[PDB]
TrEMBL record, chains A, B, C:
Belongs to the 2-oxoacid dehydrogenase family. This is dihydrolipoyllysine-residue succinyltransferase. GO terms for molecular function: dihydrolipoyllysine-residue succinyltransferase activity. Its EC number is 2.3.1.61. The chain holds residues 188 to 420 of 420 of the full protein. The keyword Methyltransferase does not apply. It is an enzyme of class 2 (transferase).
Length: 233, 233, 233, 210
């Protein structure tokens, strides 16, 4: 009633490195709620505008990546990394951010990192996201397009997710989670009405994060997302 | 102020096998929200009907098990298992489902699996659940009634739970969680009203699941539960 | 672009003991929702009253600690501890509770335990909390003020947290989580209105807890908090 | 030596007001600068010059054999009142800098103007010019060029006036604008799209975020 099937090398390697990314890093997850209607109206209007102007598809991931970049800029412990060989550690603090995004494919999940994104706006972020997407659909992504990376944003929103616990991408130190924005009742300005809010997640490395830095990280990302005017500062 | 008490063999063995079920399997949990009123009305009306007809107590666990069976039938990676001895793995794909249910007892938690349930309806599912329940209340459950099992549904709903992170039952690959349906506000069809919704959980084995398969698994279970007419297909 | 920075001894020790507190204890987290308005009105009115009378700042942590003490008194497995050296365990049951609270500082997070708190009311709980707070602000807390401890209450509410997964404090067995009470819609008494409710968490040690004891623990804490009149019994 | 033409437009400004007050208290807590409208106007001007480069042009030819310039760097000149009269110290290259540092350098120039340390080089140069007549009771007006510059914007004391927004009439704090061309460089086309793009950036800073 059961068939004998072996595996491939990449499956064994991802299993081994995923197990290694859990017994060598204390993982803790935090959630929050973010209203997202302003992002929706912004995105549709200036998505048609920017499609007319430059020809890129405005989306939420650019805004989330920019908010992540700003919140790392105002708190540098998220981009840290314990690179010491189990001893004599050499915790890193890096100005450059190399956010890794996830794109679906036939092999499964593909995570090609964008290069230094600390100094670049939403438009070029979306442009490089589209570039990575087209390089993923027709496979030209070589090894170096996946190597490295300091942060990671994983989109589980295309599916029907609501919440969940992501994993770290060792030697990384944090991972954000996007969870398929939905219409839910809200207690805004003293009244209850339907708004399209969204959940979030953040898998710590508690030997680096203390819940304090990660919680202010996530709440600052949330408040940036709630109104991009704050991100404008 | 503290007394010296030893343990029993089963406590040591459950502790050891529970620790083993965590350092050899990447566990990830996902939640979702499901409206449940239709299940309630269905269950009460045809519970009295079926008690008159055949004499079994219609409950939610039968519906959840049937939805789980269907969602495994349309995605076969949930019933997988890494049986390889830490190397040279032989990932399994099995047509038969041997869902394990949990019943409370004096010893603690008892998980006797039902036998092949891929081809059987709600009525016989409830009948075998009642059979296992009566065999658990008056102890006749031997070892073979607990051995094996491919899936697992754990009911924390009898208690006052709201959410939570379940564990895997190695060599299993996924575990569902029932979380004590409650009356909460909803953003259904453009209005806010009280409906008895319920949370869910799914502990992956990320060396087998990819978040993709598990998330479609859980969302398909959710949509089957929302209206059993979909499960009828 | 990256600077070479070493660490301090306490950082290495906290990393090592935090990793040890995860590979030797099965951690499971449960959440719940608790309405908190009655606590707010109680706290403000009799906070000004008690500031006039004795001179202490009434807060929520005293109520939470007292509810925790009562719920441990009616279920003694939470204060247990696996002190056996990986074998020949000697599970403890203790009448005295030594709840550990967390106070922020320049070094990071400081967790000085209160002494036996099974027999003491809210007023003296707040008094000793203020004593620990002042001993933490001006550093006089020696080693023995941090040693020991059977339970742990961690306040992430001062920050902007909503939920999260806490860690155990081995050789402890459970940890509660306070998560920054917020105004959210509720399905109370058949109607929907805004109430300041709050989330909770409880990291088990599943080789001691069974989900049953921990879930009744947390639900009893919740019902005590919902109205202190129940705690009065 | 410069054909001057002025264009006006109307801009709703309430969103700028709420943005400015909330994140003015926020930024005063955080960094310690006074958020104001001039930073937003300067940033919108910088973007609208970035998408149209003829505004930063200049006829430097000696009345003949001209050598029209196109420059990437923008050196916006702002006006601060003083005892001598009007003082226009230019900010340095502002094409790559955000609102916060714009406000910081504006405050720096303001304090260097109140206690006089502004030397000659702090006034020399400049490619654009933003003149604030809003502190006074102005409503509209025709500004002048600052040769060898090519355009000058005008801020005109935002006021509450009826509006025909979204099919209804209600009071909104709108504001007038001005732009003195150099019609031997501008053609009304480039300047009008310049001013309308500045206006639409100001109406909602989310557009400026792109």
């Amino acid at each position: 009633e059961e068939r004998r099937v072996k595996m491939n090398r990449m499956r064994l390697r991802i299993a081994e490195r995923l197990k290694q990314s859990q017994n060598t890093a204390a993982s803790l997850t935090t959630f929050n709620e973010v209203d997202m209607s302003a992002l929706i109206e912004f995105r549709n209007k200036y998505k048609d505008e920017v499609l007319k102007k430059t020809g890129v598809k405005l989306g939420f991931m650019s805004a989330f990546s920019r908010a992540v970049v700003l919140a790392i800029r105002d708190l540098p412990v998220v981009n840290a990394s314990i690179e010491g060989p189990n001893g004599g550690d050499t915790i890193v603090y890096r100005d450059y951010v190399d956010i890794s995004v996830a794109v679906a494919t036939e092999k499964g999940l593909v995570t090609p990192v964008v290069r230094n994104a600390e100094t670049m706006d939403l438009i070029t972020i979306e442009k490089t996201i589209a570039e990575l997407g087209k390089k993923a659909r027709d496979g030209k992504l070589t090894i170096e397009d996946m190597a490295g990376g300091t942060f990671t944003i994983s989109n589980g929103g295309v599916f029907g997710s609501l919440m969940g616990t992501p994993i770290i991408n060792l030697p990384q130190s944090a991972v954000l989670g996007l969870h398929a924005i939905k219409e839910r009742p809200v207690a805004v300005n003293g009244k209850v009405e339907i708004r399209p809010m969204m959940y979030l997640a953040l898998t710590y490395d508690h030997r680096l994060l203390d819940g304090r830095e990660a919680v202010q990280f996530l709440v600052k990302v949330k408040e940036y997302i709630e109104d991009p005017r704050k991100m404008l500062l």
